[PDB]
């Protein structure tokens, strides 16, 4: 958010949390390319974006 909506967390024990929510850029780069492969390269692809 470009440092807008600054927020922070409390400071206490969080024993058993797990948040598998992330990936490397290569994953993102790969997915982006894959996304570009599964479209008709005419205007039909661009317009929704």
């Amino acid at each position: 958010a470009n440092n807008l909506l600054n927020s922070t967390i409390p400071i206490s024990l969080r024993p058993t949390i797990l948040c598998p929510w992330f990936a490397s850029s290569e994953d993102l780069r790969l997915q982006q390319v894959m996304h570009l492969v599964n479209i008709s390269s005419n205007t039909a692809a661009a317009l929704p974006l």
Partner: protein, 99 residues
């Protein structure tokens, strides 16, 4: 990996099962294998949208590889490559095959 192993020395993958016979290596077989894998993943993880599709658009997964580039009127090219990162399941599968 799966498509390569059915081929003879395709890409640069390990081949633990190479002792087993595999006569047909036609592009049709490769497409069928890729569809099988694509369906398997969609089932296992309950995916919804298109996944791994479009690679068979030209109908020969045996040489499937991703790359992007743009060209300038001066004749210069960029030719950016997009290789996959390291994977866990792939390494796991090798142990299964070896076992």
């Amino acid at each position: 990996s799966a498509v390569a192993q059915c081929q003879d020395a395709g890409f640069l993958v390990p081949r633990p099962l190479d002792a087993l016979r595999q006569f047909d290596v036609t592009s049709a077989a490769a497409a069928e294998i890729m569809h099988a894998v694509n369906d398997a993943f969609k089932t296992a993880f309950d995916l919804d949208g298109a996944l791994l599709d479009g690679l068979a658009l030209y109908g020969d997964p045996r040489i499937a590889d991703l790359s992007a580039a743009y060209l300038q009127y001066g004749g210069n090219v960029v030719r950016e490559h997009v290789p996959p990162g390291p994977s866990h399941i792939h390494r796991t599968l090798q142990q299964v095959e070896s076992t």
